[PDB]
């Protein structure tokens, strides 16, 4: 037997369905998604951390001149300053008042702490989906981490489940993302080799242990102070530290649909968007014939309590006189109510209680049991709590919240005016016929 159902991708909310055959007992299927993951494929574009300006010891030539060695280090700059008179603790270093030279040389390296305090710039694409479902079919219960790609079956006890594809391709991560301190940011970082001074990515390394480094920090050498041995320099302040000053909240705080962003791997969990289509292939072994299952008779449904709250705010009591004890796949084919229990024990004679959640002020649905179709009606009342801490289990229909009084008023306004129009039309037709027949 083949089934094609579709369930909302809301984690932590159970979803119940019934399968019906021409000559077999109805069977209940309950699916509970405990965790839905979205794992994009990420490529490590590069790694950025605080830089460190390393200066070679000044090359002081007394009564002579030097030349600039060729540049090979990241952002490395060399300059020769003439007419210097350096001093040390012993005294004057040179004996010529002029024509002394000092070679100053600077470059940029990664900080010593780049192995721990660094940000990884990634490119994110090709999201995949994984669902941790508790699946109960034919009183057979399992837990599976099913991939929500359409291609892959999951098999158990002869039952095949083909989840996917996801209805919506929406993802929280954009093309370019940044990981830092276990948090994910949607940042449009510069490409490798295109970093700019004073901004994120001003220095870039392909990997945290890579031997390369692209540096762009506007390093410029200044003239040494008179009678001093040092290499003055001027740089734009670190782009990493400035970025940390102006990070903005991470994705875990700014993601839509209530997604929860995690790292290692980079995942988005429990996104309340889209729907999962499920394809079921159930062997006939689990199915039971109508004769084997108990048959219901003389059942009446009473709504002894109903509040249209988000949770199961209603109890329905059904009086039953069944042929024998057994298990019934209790279900409401309509969307008026959502049933907490997908199956109920059944005895020879008695009353059974079923917990249901409805958004209707005046509910009236067809509760389906082992074989019967009981009609259940009643009245519900607004709940105590203005705000709760769980999502609504039921679904809201367009006419769900319209009361009987509102319906009567609407019928009087729309339905009484039509009556007045009909009366006027009848009177006009009668008058016209009367005057026309009285001419001759």
């Amino acid at each position: 037997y083949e089934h094609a159902t579709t369930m909302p991708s809301q984690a932590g909310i159970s979803y119940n369905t019934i399968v019906n055959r021409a000559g077999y007992a109805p069977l209940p299927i309950s699916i509970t998604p405990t965790k839905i993951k979205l794992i994009p494929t990420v490529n490590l574009e590069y790694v950025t951390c605080h830089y460190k300006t390393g200066m070679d010891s000044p090359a002081i030539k007394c009564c002579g001149s030097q030349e600039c060695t060729p540049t090979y280090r990241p952002d490395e700059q060399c300059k020769v300053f003439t007419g210097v008179y350096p001093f040390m603790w012993g005294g004057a270093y040179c004996f010529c008042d002029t024509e002394n030279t000092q070679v100053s040389k600077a470059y940029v390296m990664k900080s010593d702490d780049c192995l721990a305090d660094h940000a990884e710039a990634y490119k994110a694409h090709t999201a995949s989906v994984q669902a941790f479902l508790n699946i109960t079919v034919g009183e057979h219960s399992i837990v599976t981490t099913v991939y929500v790609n359409g291609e892959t079956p999951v098999n158990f006890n002869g039952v095949k489940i083909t989840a996917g594809p996801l209805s919506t391709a929406w993802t929280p991560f954009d093309r370019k993302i940044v990981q830092y301190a276990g948090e994910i940011y949607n940042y449009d970082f510069p490409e490798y080799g295109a970093g700019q001074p004073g901004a994120f990515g001003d220095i870039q390394s392909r990997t945290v242990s890579s031997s390369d480094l692209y540096a762009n920090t506007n390093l410029v050498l200044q003239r040494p102070k008179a009678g001093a041995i040092h290499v003055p320099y001027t740089q734009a302040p670190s782009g990493f530290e400035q970025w940390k000053k102006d990070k903005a909240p991470s994705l875990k705080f700014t993601a839509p649909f209530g997604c929860e962003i995690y790292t290692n791997p980079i995942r988005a969990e429990n996104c309340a968007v889209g729907s999962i289509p499920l394809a079921f292939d159930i062997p006939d072994a689990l199915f039971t014939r109508v004769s084997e299952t108990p048959t219901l008779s003389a059942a009446e449904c009473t709504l002894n309590e109903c509040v249209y709250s988000s949770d199961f705010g209603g109890i329905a009591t059904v009086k039953y006189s069944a042929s024998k004890s057994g298990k019934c796949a209790v279900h409401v084919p309509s969307g008026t109510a959502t049933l907490k229990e997908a199956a109920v024990e059944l005895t020879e004679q008695g009353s059974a209680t079923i917990h249901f959640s409805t958004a209707n002020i005046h509910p009236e649905f067809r509760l389906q049991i082992c074989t019967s179709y009981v009609t259940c009606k009643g009245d519900c009342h607004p709940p105590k709590d203005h705000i709760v801490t769980h999502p609504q289990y039921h679904a809201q229909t367009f006419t769900a919240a319209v009361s009987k009084t509102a319906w009567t008023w609407l019928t009087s306004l729309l339905g009484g005016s039509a009556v007045i129009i009909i009366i006027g039309l009848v009177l006009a037709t009668i008058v016209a016929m009367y005057v026309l027949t009285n001419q001759k």
Partner: protein, 100 residues
Amino acid sequence: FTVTEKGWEFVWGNHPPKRFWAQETAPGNPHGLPHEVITHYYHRYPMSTILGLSICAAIATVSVAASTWLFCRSRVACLTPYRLTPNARIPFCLAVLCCA
């Protein structure tokens, strides 16, 4: 902050995030007088009551005006054949329907 049926969460300092969802508990009573019903269905479902109520009122007014117009036209068409008689004898229509 406004919390709808879709959800709303806040993080206060280092506390774990707290999530909240709304429920249909509007002021007013649907099983009551028309003003209470309008208040209940305006606090809930806004722009669906203002539009609906206005449409209903417009339809009712148009229907009443049209019914009055046809009634007046029928009265004229049933009286003028008898009205413009030089001696103005109108027993029959007044006896059968009391139009005047």
